[PDB]
From a paper:
Mitogen-activated protein kinase kinase kinase kinase 1 ([name]) is a serine/threonine kinase that acts as an immune checkpoint downstream of T-cell receptor stimulation. [name] activity is enhanced by prostaglandin E2 (PGE2) and transforming growth factor beta (TGFβ), immune modulators commonly present in the tumor microenvironment. Therefore, its pharmacological inhibition is an attractive immuno-oncology concept for inducing therapeutic T-cell responses in cancer patients. Through its proline-rich domain, [name] binds to a diversity of adaptors in hematopoietic cells, including those involved in T-cell receptor (TCR), B-cell receptor, and cytokine-induced signaling. The function of [name] has been studied most extensively in the context of T-cell activation.
Protein X-ray crystallography confirmed that the urea moiety interacts in a bidentate hydrogen bond with the Asp101 side chain in [name] (Asp112 in the surrogate kinase [name]). Ureas synthesized from cyclic amines, which reduced overall H-bond donors by one (not shown), also displayed more than a 10-fold decrease in activity, highlighting the importance of the two hydrogen bonds for overall potency.
Residue numbers in the entry: 23 to 38, 43 to 298
The structure:
C-alpha cells in the first residue's frame, strides 16, 4: 500500500519494458516489468495468475504489483544472466553436453513441479529458461500456460511457438502435460545447435510438417554422445501416451549424472 518508488530504487533497463531494481528494505535485487495500464493485459494477467500459484526454486517468482502514474509494475525474481538464448548469442557459442545436462536437469524439476500442479507451460524454449548469476535455471513466460482440471483432463488450444510445438498440440486432438516434454527435446537441439530444427523454414509451413514428419534428430549426429542422442529421441516420441514424463527423464543417464551449477560459472562469467 506504499508508493512503488519509496519501496524500490529502479536501476538500469534490462529489456525492451523491464528494469533491475533494489527492494530498499532488504537490499534484494528484483526485476520490475512496466506495462501501460491502457495496453492489452490478457497475457500479463494469465502469466501473473499462474506464477502467483507457483512456489518452486525452478520457476521465476512473482512478488506483487503496483500502479505508478498510468503503468502497472510487475515485481519478479531477478535472473541476472538473462535467458539461455541470450547466453548462446552473447558468447557466440552453442552449449556443451555437460552445460546442457545441468540446465535441463533444473528445467525438468520445474516441469515435474508444474505437471504435478496440472499446469502445461506450452512455450518451453531456450528464450524462456532464465539463469540467475549463481547458475540456477528458472522457467519464465507463462503467457500461454494451460491448467488441467477435474472436468478438463485435456487442453486443445493450438498454442505455443511453432518450431517447439508438439504434434498433438498442432493437431485438433486434445493433449496434456507431456506436450512440454516434446518442447524440451526441441530446446535440447536448440541449445546444442543454436536454433531448432526447421529454423530456416516459414513458421506456418513448419507447423504443417511437424505432425507428418519423423521426429527430428541432430544435424551432425557424430558430435553427440549415445546418452544425449537417446535423451532427445525419448523427448521427441510422437505418441503422447508413450512419451516419457519429467519424473522418468530425471532418471535418464544424460540428466541423472549432470554436474552441479559450478559448470555454468565459466559460461555465466563470459556472458556477463
Ligand atoms: C535483442 O535480443 C534481446 C536481448 N536480450 C534480452 O532482452 N534479454 C532479456 C532477458 C530477460 F530475462 C529479461 O527479463 C528478466 C531479466 C532478469 N530477471 C527477470 N525476471 C523476470 C524477468 C522477466 C522479463 C519478462 N518477463 C515476462 C515474461 C513477464 N519476465 C526477467 C529481459 F528484460 C531481457
Ligand atoms: N563478460 C565480461 C567479463 C568476463 O568475460 O569475465 C567481458 O566479456
Amino acid at each position: 500500500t506504499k508508493q512503488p518508488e519509496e519501496v524500490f530504487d529502479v536501476l538500469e533497463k534490462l529489456g525492451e519494458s523491464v528494469y533491475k531494481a533494489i527492494h530498499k528494505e532488504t537490499g534484494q535485487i528484483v526485476a520490475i516489468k512496466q506495462v501501460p495500464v491502457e495496453s492489452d493485459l490478457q497475457e500479463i494477467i494469465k502469466e501473473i495468475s499462474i506464477m502467483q500459484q507457483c512456489d518452486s526454486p525452478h520457476v521465476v517468482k512473482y512478488y506483487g504489483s503496483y500502479f505508478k502514474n498510468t503503468d502497472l509494475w510487475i515485481v519478479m525474481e531477478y535472473c541476472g544472466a538473462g535467458s539461455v538464448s541470450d547466453i548462446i548469442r552473447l558468447r557466440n557459442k552453442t552449449l556443451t553436453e555437460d552445460e546442457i545436462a545441468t540446465i535441463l536437469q533444473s528445467t525438468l524439476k520445474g516441469l515435474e513441479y508444474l505437471h504435478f500442479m496440472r499446469k502445461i507451460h506450452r512455450d518451453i524454449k531456450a528464450g524462456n529458461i532464465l539463469l540467475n548469476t549463481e547458475g540456477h535455471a528458472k522457467l519464465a513466460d507463462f503467457g500461454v500456460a494451460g491448467q488441467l482440471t477435474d472436468t478438463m483432463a485435456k487442453r486443445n488450444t493450438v498454442i505455443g511457438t511453432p518450431f517447439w510445438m508438439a504434434p498433438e498440440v498442432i493437431q485438433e486432438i486434445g493433449y496434456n502435460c507431456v506436450a512440454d516434454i516434446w518442447s524440451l527435446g526441441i530446446t535440447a537441439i536448440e541449445m546444442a545447435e543454436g536454433k531448432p530444427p526447421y529454423a530456416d523454414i516459414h513458421p506456418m509451413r513448419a507447423i504443417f510438417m511437424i505432425p507428418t514428419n519423423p521426429p527430428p534428430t541432430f544435424r551432425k549426429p557424430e558430435l553427440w554422445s549415445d546418452n544425449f542422442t537417446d535423451f532427445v529421441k525419448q523427448c521427441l516420441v510422437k505418441s503422447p501416451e508413450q512419451r516419457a514424463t519429467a519424473t522418468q527423464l530425471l532418471q535418464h543417464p544424460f540428466v541423472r549424472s549432470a554436474k552441479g551449477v559450478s559448470i555454468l560459472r565459466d559460461l555465466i562469467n563470459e556472458a556477463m
